[PDB]
Amino acid sequence: NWLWYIRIFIIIVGSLIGLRIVFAVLSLVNRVRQGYSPLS
């Protein structure tokens, strides 16, 4: 019952962390490629 909610929260947090990592990886690739100058 309770553990159920705990598991969901854990998964939710993991998803957020993954998304961030993926975004960071892409940002690094863009910089290495230097195809275009970033807006920021």
Q: What is the DSSP string of 1-40?
A: -HHHHHHHHHHHHHHHHHHHHHHHHHHHHHHHHTSS----
Report the distance separating Cα 37 and Cα 17, nearest Å. 27
Query: What residue numbers bound the domain in which 35 lies?
Result: 1-40
What lies within 8 Å, CB to CB, of 35 at 6+ separation is: none
Domain count, the chain: 1
Report the distance separating Cα 17 and Cα 10, nearest Å. 11
Give the CA angle between residues 37, 39, 40 to the nearest 5°: 110
Structure tokens at 28: 């690094």
Greatest Cα-to-Cα distance within the chain, rounded to the nearest angstrom = 51
Q: What's the N-to-C CA distance of the chain in angstroms?
A: 46
List own/partner pairs for 33-37 with CB under 8 A and 24 or more apart.
Answer: none
C-beta of residue 38 within 8 angstroms of C-beta of residue 30: yes
